[PDB]
C-alpha cells in the first residue's frame, strides 16, 4: 500500500465511498493496497513498450504478465494484446476478490453479510477453509465455492447455540 499525494480531494473521495459501499470494504488503505499493486504492474508495462517487437524479454516476461492475469480472471480473451493492460480499471481487481464473488454466486444476500460469513470459518475453496477476504480467485475454483462439511448450511453439526435452543425446548417442554 501507499498513501496518495492529496489527502482531501472531494470527487476522488466521492468514488472511494462508492466502491467501498459497493464492494463492502472497511478501510481506504484496502483501496490503497490495490492501487499500489497496480502502480508497480502498470509501471513495468511501459518499460516493455520501450523495447523492440518480438524482444525475448518482452516475449517471456510480457506474456508471463499475461498468464498471471488470465489466471486471476482479470484479463479477457480477446484483449490479449498487451494494450488493454494499459487501458485497465481498478474495479476489475475488486471484482476478483472472493468477498464479492460469493455474492455474485448468489447465496450472500448482502455485501456486508458475506464478510460476516468469511470470518466465521465458512466457505472452503476446495478442502481448504479460508479466512482471508482478499483471495483473488483462481477463476477455476469458482464452481467449487461451497460450504464446509461442518459450519451449517454445510451441515453435519447444528452447533452449540442451536443446541441451546434445542436444550431450551427439550428441557422446558420436556423434563
Amino acid at each position: 500500500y501507499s498513501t496518495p499525494k492529496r489527502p482531501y480531494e472531494s470527487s476522488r473521495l466521492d468514488a472511494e465511498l462508492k466502491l467501498a459501499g459497493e464492494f463492502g470494504l472497511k478501510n481506504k488503505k484496502e483501496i490503497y493496497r490495490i492501487s499500489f499493486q497496480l502502480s508497480k504492474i502498470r509501471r513495468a508495462a511501459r518499460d516493455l513498450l520501450t523495447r523492440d517487437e518480438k524482444d525475448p524479454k518482452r516475449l517471456f516476461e510480457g506474456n508471463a504478465l499475461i498468464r498471471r492475469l488470465v489466471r486471476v480472471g482479470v484479463l479477457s480473451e480477446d484483449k490479449k494484446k498487451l494494450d488493454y493492460v494499459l487501458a485497465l480499471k481498478v474495479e476489475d481487481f475488486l471484482e476478483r476478490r472472493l468477498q464479492t464473488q460469493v455474492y455474485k454466486l448468489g447465496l450472500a444476500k448482502s455485501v456486508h453479510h458475506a464478510r460476516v460469513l468469511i470470518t466465521q470459518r465458512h466457505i472452503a475453496v476446495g478442502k481448504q477453509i479460508v479466512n482471508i477476504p482478499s483471495f483473488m480467485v483462481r477463476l477455476d475454483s469458482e464452481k467449487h465455492i461451497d460450504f464446509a462439511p461442518t459450519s451449517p448450511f454445510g451441515g453435519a453439526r447444528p452447533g452449540r447455540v442451536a443446541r441451546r435452543n434445542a436444550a431450551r425446548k427439550a428441557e422446558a417442554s420436556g423434563e
Partner: peptide, 30 residues
C-alpha cells in the same frame, strides 16, 4: 469523558453513509 458517542464504528460506520448517499444522489441525479 462523554457518554455521547453511540454511532457505529468502522464497517457499520461505513455502512450508513452509502445508504445515505443512495438516498441522496438518487434525488440529486433524478
Amino acid at each position: 469523558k462523554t457518554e455521547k458517542p453511540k454511532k457505529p464504528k468502522g464497517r457499520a460506520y461505513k455502512r450508513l453513509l452509502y445508504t445515505r448517499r443512495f438516498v441522496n444522489v438518487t434525488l440529486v441525479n433524478g
